[PDB]
Ligand binder design. Structure first.
Ligand SMILES: O=C(c1cccc(-c2ccn[nH]2)c1)N1CCN(CC2=Cc3ccccc3OC2)CC1
Ligand SMILES: O=C(c1cccc(-c2ccn[nH]2)c1)N1CCN(CC2=Cc3ccccc3OC2)CC1
Lengths: 711, 711
C-alpha cells in the first residue's frame, strides 16, 4: 500500500487496474459513469443555477451477458470483467428530459489484455449495439484499444523441432518444422491434439510429424479476431443510420478501433490520444528508414481534427464527456421521438440585432448566435448561447453546428465569408516534400467544404433526426483545374444525395448580403426534396445564373452598349453625322473619342441593369422561393414556420400508420381539411396553435379512421 | 445547296441543324438512334458472325409530350423539336435479350439555343427520367450543352432611362434606372406591364418610374432555370438507385450538365469534349491573370478519366455508343429482372490455366480473363473475352470491371500487384506549383483505391443489380501520415457501407499468392452482410492479424528465440556451463558468439512458425471461411455456387411477397425443407438442377401458401 496515511481509501490500491489505466494516461473504465454524472450535473448548473439535484437524477447499471448470452443489469465490484469490453445503461434526468432519458456506454478496458479485441469482446460490442438499436437509444463508444488480438500457439513453442539441411551447420538452412512422438504425446495428454495439423513421415529410422498448419488451443490468435472486427464494423455502419452514435477517443484507437471511430461518424478526440491504422515503428520497418518518431504524427488531433475524422477535440476525458452530453442535448431521447424543445431566457419574440453589411467583414457566427459589443450584446438569428459548432478543425469555409430557435433544436450550415487558409503538412516519407499553404476564397464551395456540407446534412439526418437551416451564400463551386482534378463534382453531388435522404423540415435561406448562383443554387433547390425543403430569400439577397459581370459579358455586349449610347445627346448627333467624304474621318475619330470616355459608366449601367434581375422580387414572381424576408424579422418568422412544420409533420406520420397507401400531397390536404374553416392555412402561428390545442381531438379523429378494409 | 451533284440527298441541307451540330464537333441529336442501331448490329456480329438481322430487330420511337404533358411516341421529321431536349424509346433484340429489351435515350439538342437548359427542357428531362423509372428500364443521357439558360428582359433595353448626377457630365455617375410615361405605355401596349416593378416619383416637373426589379416577359432568364436544374439533379440522384443510369459526354457538359454526368455515376467521355463547371475565360476574369488557355485544361479526359468522374473514354460518338451497349449487355432488361445469362464458346467445365507465382510478377487481368502466350491461350477464372474494365484511368491499384462466369454476369474487383504511379498536374493558378509523381505500393489500399473499390461495389449494386466477386489481396490500408491526412479512414469506411447495402450474392476469394491482413480483412468479412456474403481462401492464400514479421516482433521476441536456442547442442551446453568465477567471462563471450551466428536462421524459424498459423486450414478450423479452394478448380466451383445462390435468392424473393414477415434464416430453411430428402443441401449443382427442374412446381407450392390471414 502506497501512499500511506490518506484520509479516505486508496482507490488505485483497492483496484490496481485503476492505477494501470492511469499509468496509460486514461480514465479507468469503471470511473466513466462518474464522469457522465459530473457532466450531467454541470448541464443542470448551466441551465438553472438554482435546481437542487439528488443522486436519483442519474443511474448507471453495468450490462453483462447472462448464461444464455442475453444482456442483464448488474451491480458488482469494478474490475470483475472477464472480457475486455464493458457496458453501462445510463438513465439521466436532463434539462431537456427532466423525467429521464436513456443511453448505452460501450467501452474497451485498456487494462484487459491492452484493450485488444478478441472474439468475446467483439461479440459483446455487437450485442450492446443491437441492444441500443432495438430500443432506439443512443450508443456512446469509449475507444481505448490496441486493435484485434494477436497470438500464437504457445504450446507448440516448446515442442517443435527443425529439419536441418545439415545438423552440424544450422546456418545452412532448414527444410520444415516437425513434432516427435514425445511431442505428439504431450499434446495428446493435455487434450490439445487438434492444436497442429501434421503429416507423418519416416526419416532415417525416426518418425517425424511434419507441421502443416498450427491452429492453437487458445481462441483469439488471428482470423477469428478479424471475423469479429468485420462483424462490429458492419454493426456500427448500421447503428449510424438507426440511432445516435458518438465515440470518445480516450487513450488510442488502433486498427478496428480506428474504423469504429469513423463508422460511428460523430467523434471527439482527446488531445494526445491517436487514431492509428499502423504504428510508427511498424511503418518504419516496412519503409526501411526511421521515417516517423511517434504515433501522434500519424493519428493525433493535428491529423484527425484537421481531417474532419474528429468532429471536436477535448483537453481531457471529462471535457470529452461534457461535449458528448452537450451534443446529446439537441438529440431526441430515442429514435422517432420528437426533437427535444428547450426554451431559455432568449424567447422567440424579438428582432435579430446583428446585421451584415456589404462594405464590412463579418463572422457568420455573429449572424447565427450574436456577438458581444462595447454597447451590449447584439442577438443573432438563434438562441443566445445555443450554437454548438462541430467539424470546426476541417474545411473552415463552411460553419456547421447545432443551435436552438426559440427552443427548437436544429442543424445549422453557414458560409464563412473570410478567406480560409489550411496547411498541408510535409510528408516525412518523401524527402522531396515541403508543407503547402492553401488559400480558399470565401463563399465558394471547394472539394473539402462540399464534403463537409454533405457530411453535416447526413449527420443531422441520421440518428440526430433534426430539422435543418442552410444560410445559403455561395457564388458556386471552384471550377479551376486543381479542384476539378480533386473531384469537386463528386463532393458537390454528395450534397444532392444527402438532401434527397433528409426526413425532417429543411429551410434554405439566402441571407442579407447573401447570394446563390448557377452552380450553387443547383445543389440546394427545394425541388431536390419538395416533401421537406423550402426556400426563402432576404430582400437584400441576390440570385441569378451568373454574377452581373458574367451576364453582361454574354448578354450586354459592345453593340448593345453602343446602341445604349443613344441615351447620350453628344453621341446620338456624332453617330448621325458620320452615317461629306473627307470630313468623315474627323467625325469617325470624334465618335471613338466619346465611346472611349463613356464606356466606363455605360459598363456600370449594364452591370446595374443585370443586377436588377437578381432580386428576391423576381424570385417571388417566378415562384422559386416561398417568401421574400426581412432579416430583423426572420427569427419570429422561422420560429413559427418551423413550429407549424413540426406539427403538420407529426400529423403526416400518424396518417401514414393508418390507411398507409396515400401520397404526401393527399395526406397533408386531408390533415388541412380538418382545420376549422376560419383557420388561414398560410398562418403558421394559428395553424401550430390550433394543432397543439387539439392533439387529443385529432388523435380521436385518427383512431376513428381505423375503419380500414384496405386490400 | 452545297455540295452539288451528290449521289443521294445532302442530309446537312435538308436539315441545316445537322450541319450546325457537325460544325460543333458532335453527332446531330436525331442521328444518335442510328448509332445505337449500328452498335447493336455489331454486338450481333461479335456474338454470332452467322446471324441474319433484319431492321425489325431495332426500333426507335421519339417521345414527346402530348396536350396534357404526358409522354407519347411520334414519328416526325428530325429538327421539329420545339424544346432543346429530345428523347427516344429504344426496343432492341440483343444476344442476351433476343426477344427484345427496352431503354430510353434523353439528349440535349446542341443546335437548340446552344443546348442550354431552360424550364421546359428541365421539365421534359424530369418527365423522361420518371417514365424510365416507372417502367424500371435504363436511362441513357447524351450530354451536349451550355448549362442553365441565361437572359435579360430585352424589352426593357430600348426603354430604360438613367438618372445622372449631372446630365452634362455622365462620367460623374448615376443614381438609379427609370422608365418614362412613354416607356410605361410601350409596356402597357404590348401587355408586358409586369415586365418591371416600378415606383413612381416626381423629379422637376416630370414623372419618373424608378425600376426596382426587372422581371421580363420571356421565361428562362434566370432563377426559374436554376429551380429546374435542382429538379433534374434530384431526379438523377434518385434514378441512380432505381434504374441503370449512364451518360455519354458528346460535345461539352457545363454547370448542371456536369452535375448530371456525376449524379448518373456511370459516364463515358468522348476525347476532347469537356465536363466543366466554370469556363476558362470566366475563371481568368475572376483571377485577374490569363491563367487558363482552354476548357480542356479544366474538364478534359486527362482530368475526368484520371479522376474517376469518367469511367471510360471514347475516340468518337459511335465508340461511346458501342461502350454503352456493351456495358448494358451485363445488365437486366429492367429493374428486378434476373441478371442476363449469356453462354459463349468458353463453357464453365474447364480448369483455370493462368496461375500466379510468388517469384514472378503478374497482371491481375490474366487471372480474370486469361492471357495469350507463345504456346497458346491460358484461360483465366472468367469467360474468354468477357472482361469489361471500367474506371480504368483512376486509382489503378484496384482493377474493376464486369465479367461472365459460364455466362453469369457479375462485377469483379481485383488487386493490382505492380506498383502504380500517377501524376498530379501543376496548378496553373499557382506559380509556386510543379507536377507531383506519386508511387503507391501494390496490395495496399490508399484513399483513391479505397474510394474506387466502394464506388465499384455501389455501381454493381444500384441499377446494375449484379452479384459480385472480390479477388481480395490486400496487406491493409496505408497508415502513413500523408494517407491518414488524406482521410484513408473515410474511404475505407465507404467500403463497409457499400457492402451493408448490397442486395445480390457476394463471393470474397483470397486467391493463390494472395493475402488478407488485420486492416484489410475488417472491411471485407462476410459478417458485414451475412445474407449476401461468403468467403473462400485458396490453399495457397495467407491471412492473419499481422504479417509474419509483425507477429514475431510482438510474440516471438529475443527471450523466446534464445529459449529456442535449446534446439542447439553447442548452445545448450554453453548456457549450462555459464550458469568457476574467472573462466565465466570466456564462457559468456562464447554464448554471445553462438547467439550472434545462430540469430539469422532462428529469425527465419520464428518467421516460418508465425506463417504456419496464417494458412487456409486454420481459417476452415476457426470457421471464418466457407471452404478452402484450389485455384485450378475455382471456375467449376464458383459457377455452380453462384448458379445455386441465384436460384435460392429467387425463391427467397418469392417467399417474401407471400406471408411477408419472416427472417431470411426462416425463409431459406423453409425453401430447403421443400427439397427431396435425398438432395444434399451442400451440393450446389444438385440444388440448382433440382430448382430449375421444378420452378413451375415450386410456383404451385408458393401460390398454395397464399392462404394468408396474417394480421
Ligand atoms: O458569373 C460569373 C462570372 C464572373 C465574372 C466574369 C464572368 C464571365 C462570363 C463570361 N466571361 N466572363 C462570369 N461566375 C459565376 C460565379 N463563379 C463563382 C466562382 C468564384 C471562384 C472564386 C475562386 C476560385 C474559383 C471560383 O469559381 C467559382 C465565378 C464566375
Ligand atoms: O504486420 C505488419 C508488419 C510488418 C513488418 C513489421 C511489423 C512490426 C510490428 C511491430 N513492429 N514492427 C509489422 N504490417 C501489417 C500489414 N501492413 C500493410 C501495409 C503496408 C504498407 C506499404 C506501403 C505503405 C503503407 C503500408 O501500410 C500498410 C504493413 C505492416
Amino acid at each position: 500500500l502506497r501512499p500511506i496515511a490518506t484520509p479516505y481509501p486508496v482507490k488505485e490500491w483497492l483496484q490496481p487496474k485503476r492505477y494501470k489505466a492511469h499509468l496509460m494516461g486514461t480514465t479507468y473504465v469503471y470511473d466513466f459513469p462518474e464522469l457522465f454524472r459530473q457532466a450531467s450535473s454541470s448541464q443542470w448548473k448551466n441551465f438553472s443555477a438554482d435546481v437542487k439535484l439528488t443522486d436519483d437524477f442519474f443511474i448507471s447499471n453495468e450490462l453483462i451477458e447472462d448464461e444464455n448470452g442475453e444482456l442483464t443489469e448488474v451491480e458488482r465490484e469494478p474490475g470483475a470483467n472477464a472480457i475486455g469490453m464493458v457496458a453501462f445503461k445510463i438513465t439521466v434526468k436532463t434539462p431537456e428530459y427532466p423525467r429521464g432519458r436513456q443511453f448505452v456506454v460501450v467501452a474497451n478496458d485498456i487494462t484487459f489484455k491492452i484493450g485488444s479485441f478478441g472474439p468475446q469482446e467483439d461479440e459483446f460490442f455487437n450485442k450492446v449495439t443491437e441492444y441500443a438499436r432495438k430500443r432506439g437509444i443512443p450508443r456512446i463508444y469509449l475507444a481505448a484499444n490496441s486493435g484485434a488480438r494477436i497470438g500464437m500457439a504457445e504450446e507448440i513453442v516448446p515442442l517443435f523441432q527443425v529439419a536441418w539441411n545439415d545438423a552440424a551447420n544450422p546456418d545452412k538452412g532448414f527444410q520444415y518444422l516437425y513434432l516427435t512422438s514425445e511431442g505428439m504425446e504431450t499434446l495428446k495428454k493435455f487434450d490439445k491434439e487438434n492444436s497442429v495439423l501434421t503429416e507423418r513421415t519416416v526419416i532415417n529410422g525416426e518418425e517425424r510429424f511434419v507441421i502443416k498448419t498450427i491452429i492453437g488451443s487458445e481462441d483469439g490468435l488471428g482470423v477469428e479476431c478479424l471475423r469479429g472486427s468485420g462483424l462490429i464494423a458492419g454493426a456500427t455502419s448500421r447503428a449510424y443510420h438507426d440511432i445516435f452514435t458518438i465515440t470518445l477517443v480516450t487513450c488510442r484507437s488502433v486498427g478496428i478501433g480506428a474504423y469504429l471511430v469513423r463508422l460511428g461518424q460523430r467523434a471527439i478526440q482527446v488531445e494526445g490520444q491517436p487514431i492509428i491504422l499502423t504504428g510508427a515503428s511498424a511503418l518504419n520497418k516496412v519503409l526501411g528508414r526511421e521515417v516517423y518518431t511517434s504515433n501522434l504524427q500519424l493519428g493525433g488531433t493535428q491529423i484527425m481534427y484537421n481531417n474532419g475524422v474528429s468532429h471536436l477535440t477535448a483537453v481531457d476525458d471529462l471535457a470529452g464527456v461534457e461535449k458528448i452530453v452537450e451534443w446529446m442535448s439537441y438529440v431526441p431521447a430515442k429514435r422517432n421521438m420528437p426533437v427535444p424543445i428547450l426554451e431559455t431566457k432568449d424567447t422567440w419574440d424579438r428582432p435579430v440585432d446583428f446585421t451584415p453589411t456589404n462594405d464590412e467583414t463579418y463572422d457568420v457566427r455573429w449572424m447565427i448566435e450574436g456577438r458581444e459589443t462595447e454597447s451590449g450584446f447584439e442577438y443573432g438569428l438563434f438562441d443566445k448561447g445555443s450554437f454548438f459548432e462541430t467539424l470546426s478543425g476541417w474545411a473552415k469555409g463552411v460553419v456547421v453546428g447545432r443551435a436552438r430557435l426559440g427552443g427548437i433544436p436544429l442543424g445549422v450550415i453557414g458560409v464563412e465569408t473570410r478567406t480560409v487558409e489550411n496547411l498541408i503538412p510535409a510528408d516525412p516519407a518523401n524527402p522531396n516534400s515541403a508543407e503547402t499553404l492553401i488559400q480558399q476564397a470565401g463563399q465558394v464551395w471547394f472539394p473539402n467544404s462540399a464534403f463537409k456540407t454533405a457530411q453535416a446534412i447526413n449527420d443531422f439526418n441520421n440518428g440526430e433526426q433534426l430539422p435543418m437551416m442552410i444560410l445559403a451564400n455561395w457564388r458556386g463551386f471552384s471550377g479551376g483545374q486543381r479542384d476539378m482534378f480533386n473531384e469537386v463534382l463528386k463532393y458537390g453531388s454528395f450534397i444532392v444525395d444527402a438532401l434527397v435522404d433528409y426526413k425532417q423540415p429543411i429551410i434554405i435561406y439566402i441571407p442579407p448580403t447573401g447570394e446563390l448562383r448557377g452552380g450553387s443554387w443547383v445543389v440546394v433547390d427545394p425541388t431536390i426534396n419538395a416533401d421537406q425543403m423550402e426556400m426563402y430569400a432576404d430582400v437584400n439577397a441576390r440570385a441569378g445564373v451568373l454574377e452581373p459581370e458574367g451576364t453582361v459579358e454574354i448578354k450586354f455586349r459592345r453593340e448593345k452598349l453602343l446602341d445604349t449610347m443613344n441615351r447620350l445627346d453628344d453621341k446620338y448627333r456624332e453617330l448621325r453625322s458620320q452615317l461629306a467624304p473627307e470630313v468623315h474621318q474627323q467625325i469617325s475619330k470624334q465618335l471613338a473619342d466619346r465611346e472611349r470616355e463613356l464606356l466606363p459608366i455605360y459598363g456600370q449601367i449594364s452591370l446595374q441593369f443585370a443586377d436588377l434581375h437578381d432580386r428576391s422580387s423576381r424570385m417571388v414572381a417566378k415562384g422559386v422561393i416561398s417568401k421574400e424576408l426581412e432579416w430583423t424579422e426572420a427569427r419570429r418568422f422561422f420560429f413559427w414556420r418551423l413550429r407549424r412544420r413540426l406539427n403538420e409533420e407529426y400529423l403526416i406520420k400518424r396518417l401514414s400508420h393508418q390507411v398507409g397507401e396515400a401520397s404526401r400531397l393527399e395526406k397533408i390536404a386531408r390533415i388541412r381539411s380538418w382545420y376549422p374553416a376560419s383557420v388561414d392555412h398560410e398562418d403558421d402561428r394559428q395553424v401550430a396553435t390550433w394543432i397543439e390545442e387539439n392533439y387529443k381531438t385529432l388523435d380521436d379523429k385518427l383512431k376513428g379512421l381505423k375503419l380500414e378494409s384496405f386490400a
